[PDB]
Amino acid sequence: DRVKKLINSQISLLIGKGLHEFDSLRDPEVNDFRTKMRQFCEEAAAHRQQLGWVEWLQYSFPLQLEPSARGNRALLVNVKFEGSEESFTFQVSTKDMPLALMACALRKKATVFRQPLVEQPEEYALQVNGRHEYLYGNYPLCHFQYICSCLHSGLTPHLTMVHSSSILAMRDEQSNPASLWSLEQPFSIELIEGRKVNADERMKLVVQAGLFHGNEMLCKTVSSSEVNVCSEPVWKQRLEFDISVCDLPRMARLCFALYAVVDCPIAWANLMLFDYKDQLKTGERCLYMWPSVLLNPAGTVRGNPNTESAAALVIYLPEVAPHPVYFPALEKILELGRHGERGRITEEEQLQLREILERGELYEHEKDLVWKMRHEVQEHFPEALARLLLVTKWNKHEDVAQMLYLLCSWPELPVLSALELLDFSFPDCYVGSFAIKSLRKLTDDELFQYLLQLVQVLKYESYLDCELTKFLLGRALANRKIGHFLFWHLRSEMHVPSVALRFGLIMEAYCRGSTHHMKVLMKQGEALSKLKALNDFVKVSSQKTTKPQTKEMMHMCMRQETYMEALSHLQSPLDPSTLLEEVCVEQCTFMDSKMKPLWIMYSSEEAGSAGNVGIIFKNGDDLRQDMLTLQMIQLMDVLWKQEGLDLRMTPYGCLPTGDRTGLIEVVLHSDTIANIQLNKSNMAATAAFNKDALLNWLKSKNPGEALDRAIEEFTLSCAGYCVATYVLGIGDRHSDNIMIRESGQLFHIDFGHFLGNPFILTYDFVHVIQQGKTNNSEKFERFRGYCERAYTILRRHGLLFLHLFALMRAAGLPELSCSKDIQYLKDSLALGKTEEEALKHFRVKFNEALRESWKTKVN
Ligand SMILES: CNS(=O)(=O)c1cc(N2CCOc3ccc(C(=O)NC4CCN(C)CC4)cc32)cnc1OC
């Protein structure tokens, strides 16, 4: 089939890894995942191509609703009919549903075109002009992001009446073409020899190994004897662990750490004891070690792919039985765990359990209580499942068998509890499966909010075919926006050798279930290719020639045939709803930063004002910390809007796309507090006192009565950023990374340093809040009010921040690698305290930042 071979080269191109590389591994796990996932994904591709037209809209154009709408006023809208210049502007209510708007559009059409139309309002969908956005469903118009956004900017919604027939034309054009428990002996292994080893000649090499279940030690850590340093060290010694073979859990991992002493770590390596087919491993294995920066229980259970350089470690997994031993089936595990003894205790110990389970480290006598009252947990306190799972002796199969009996009979938990079970603290595969079962309830909007964390959990996975992968693939194929971001979250880390096989495999499976989207993602990947080359010309040229000259040699290069085709007509990788239509070459430029970031301007004739967008292409810098912080800010925005608090936040797009490569979304009509404070002459803001510049600037951008709105936009946005930077630890705040929109909105940029590494408020910010006045405690205290209100809202969702940041440890961020970094967040959200005790601390911290604010005023 010539059809398949072209698809095959395109997939290889898109994932920046040849599909021949996978078949060159000779690996059956890789081949079984490929075959099984292609099956699963083509079944999804088939389901989708036969979806209803409204159902196909829900896949392609999932609704962008306001946080308040999820789970009154007079409005003016302009409606057109697909394939016509003629448009109708009309009045509607913010309480009207799209069906009433479509009935208005058809009634106007009927009188204008002089026809008693057969055309039903139910037969249409409202597209947002020049955007991959639709308004459908029975929701009042204000509930839609585009409408609600339009009201705030004072713009007119621009819609196109799209008939069910053209939506089916879209679907059709986009279709895919045609026994262990009987082996009492302790755990032992023969450490044979090392290969391609590097260490100082003075030193004497030792191998240390431990048996783990995620983090927790199954038994005491055991080290080996000292060997003289050479390229090929030779041990041939037996390490006997304090654990019977029957007591080994399913998810047991044997972890190694090679370190030279007279003290320095050289390399580390891990392997699962049971294979993907649940059989206990025996024989000789070649552990291609990763460079060490004291075992690494978290690191990949897959060897270093660069088999040349890597310092290998030859081991012998000894034969435990003269027959192959597999891990007992769930039906076997449940038999052993069913027959248990129930905990009967007095009213006194009943108080102790309710006290401790609600109150998360414990004491060894209390762990014995929680285990004895484990039936009471399932019944009275199900959400305490995590505590109980932690007090389970995972190195003893009888206890583990008793736990899975309660787990398989456990009620489904809320999404907060399930997200907590995704952590590496709960490495059991049935616990992983239970957590996912309790997450199936996630809305596509919620899933999209936690997608980044779920992607990091993929790195904690021990085997390729897992329930999390199956889930994120099925949700991606059921939603084109989830599909888009899942693709990019994976594609961006393809340069990392530990994840390039897993991520490359997930992308291939996705591509098999979405042939059309692949071609849409290839077009994006082709634009990004050209931007790297164009950035490289800029980087070189900016050194030799002045900025106006480089700017024009870039503009010349952009005008080239291949660049014009490449950079035009594409879905924005920062937003699939945003179409990057016509590149405005003359308006493109670059920054005077070390990486010479490129500013790419775009416009749409069909979208009008909505099409005038820009992207920033940054190569040389790692954007993963900006994307986290912004996603965390966006969360706060959603959390606040849900309590009816709109703090006019600007959580702009930021997306890593490759190795120190990514895009950031341009927020137009905005300057830096720095550029404004320059206080340049002949400018409208030219201030007598520097404190005035910022307000003179707002006065200049918002004439007359509008300034009062611009001050409120600034006050609210200012309050939300004071909290965001406190709670999050956003340090290194200068005048050049605090920006202001012409609307009055304040926002922060350049989040390379968070979590410590209180609030930063100068008197010109206080001056704007105070409306120029010196003494204005009425206005200043509303700002403190908004700050406290916003902070109390976040604390209530403190655990959601805690659990998200926890799963984000897997991401390999240097400022987010251990529990000492989640510490800042527990301190800032004051979670081990009652709301008043927490408010008292916030008040003190606010006053302490306010006393630090009056240092500026002293002058
Ligand atoms: C620091 N420059 S960057 O890499 O382009 C970058 C940009 C942004 N955002 C994205 C949101 O929308 C924006 C709008 C404006 C700006 C900006 O820096 N304009 C200044 C204003 C004063 N002029 C004299 C020079 C240009 C930046 C952003 C964020 N992060 C970045 O890096 C980490």
From Swiss-Prot:
It catalyses: a 1,2-diacyl-sn-glycero-3-phospho-(1D-myo-inositol-4,5-bisphosphate) + ATP = a 1,2-diacyl-sn-glycero-3-phospho-(1D-myo-inositol-3,4,5-trisphosphate) + ADP + H(+); a 1,2-diacyl-sn-glycero-3-phospho-(1D-myo-inositol) + ATP = a 1,2-diacyl-sn-glycero-3-phospho-(1D-myo-inositol-3-phosphate) + ADP + H(+); 1-octadecanoyl-2-(5Z,8Z,11Z,14Z)-eicosatetraenoyl-sn-glycero-3-phospho-1D-myo-inositol 4,5-bisphosphate + ATP = 1-octadecanoyl-2-(5Z,8Z,11Z,14Z-eicosatetraenoyl)-sn-glycero-3-phospho-(1D-myo-inositol 3,4,5-triphosphate) + ADP + H(+). Residues 590-596 are annotated as: G-loop. GO terms for molecular function: 1-phosphatidylinositol-3-kinase activity; 1-phosphatidylinositol-4,5-bisphosphate 3-kinase activity; ATP binding. Pfam families: PI3_PI4_kinase, PI3K_C2, PI3K_p85B, PI3K_rbd, PI3Ka. Residues 183-318 form the C2 PI3K-type domain. Activated by growth factors and cytokine receptors through a tyrosine-kinase-dependent mechanism. Activated by RAS. IC87114 inhibits lipid kinase activity and is selective in cells at doses up to 5-10 uM. Among other effects, IC87114 reduces allergic responses, prevents the recruitment of antigen-specific T cells into target tissue, and affects natural killer cell chemotaxis. This is Phosphatidylinositol 4,5-bisphosphate 3-kinase catalytic subunit delta isoform. It comes from Mus musculus (Mouse). The lineage of its organism: Eukaryota, Metazoa, Chordata, Craniata, Vertebrata.
